[PDB]
Design a protein around this ligand. Structure first.
Ligand SMILES: NC(=[NH2+])c1ccc2[nH]c(-c3ccccc3O)nc2c1
Ligand SMILES: [Ca+2]
Ligand SMILES: [Mg+2]
Length: 223
């Protein structure tokens, strides 16, 4: 996250870190047994780490649980990143408490202009590399589809939306993929892609979760 701030320990209690010997993507806890992340974060051998603040220090509020199964969206296209969403089931149910909580799925899609909270342990430099060990947060509004499509011609589908600032300076970045975009208390997006980080007229692109609620609900109930 570039141009964001330190969230605070366990202030984003639904945030998860996917680890395969190291942190490689974020995710969101939607209930005690399931996590939603981005399909491009798919790997075999994932351990989900809940209640994390610093990812390099065991501070006492963590739960490390291995995944029993991963389900990438049936229509995920790795070339365009259309339908960039996946579900991960935990081998054991997480214990929810103040530091580990689930986020609610939306009942409708949010409007352009709505402010959301984006979080993750990704790169914090637009031109450079600096990976933080504590969770970073960013409040950013959903942009109009017209500004999103003008920035990325022929690349935005109805399952994507842009959030951020066209001036640049603030954006999600590599290491943040699969993480949450929460607006009005609902999980409305998943960090998917962008062009570099925090560049002018190149906002971040997020998977539009409101279009997948029926698939998520149906899939977790059958697995
Ligand atoms: N600028 C952005 N809004 C952004 C967000 C997440 C990203 N994740 C990545 C990424 C790059 C290489 C491999 C995996 C990634 O998730 N680039 C990203 C760019
Ligand atoms: Ca830790
Ligand atoms: Mg994240």
């Amino acid at each position: 996250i570039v141009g964001g701030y330190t969230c605070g320990a366990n202030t984003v209690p639904y945030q998860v870190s996917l680890n395969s010997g190291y942190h490689f993507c974020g995710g969101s806890l939607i209930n005690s047994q399931w996590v939603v992340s981005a399909a491009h974060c798919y790997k075999s051998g994932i351990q989900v780490r809940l209640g994390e603040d610093n990812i390099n220090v065991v501070e006492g509020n963590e739960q490390f649980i291995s995944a029993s199964k991963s389900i990438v969206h049936p229509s995920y296209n790795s070339n365009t990143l259309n339908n960039d969403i996946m579900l991960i089931k935990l081998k054991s149910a997480a214990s929810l408490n103040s530091r580990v909580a689930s986020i609610s799925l939306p009942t409708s899609c949010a409007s352009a202009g709505t402010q959301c909270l984006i979080s993750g342990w990704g790169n914090t430099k637009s031109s450079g590399t600096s990976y933080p060990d504590v969770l970073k947060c960013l409040k950013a509004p959903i942009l109009s589809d017209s500004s999103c499509k003008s920035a990325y011609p022929g690349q935005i589908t109805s399952n994507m939306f842009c959030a951020g600032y066209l001036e640049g300076g603030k954006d999600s970045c590599q290491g943040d993929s699969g993480g949450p975009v929460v607006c009005s208390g609902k999980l409305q997006g998943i960090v998917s892609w962008g062009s570099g980080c925090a560049q002018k007229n190149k906002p971040g692109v997020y998977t539009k979760v409101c279009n997948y609620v029926s698939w998520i609900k149906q899939t977790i109930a059958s697995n």
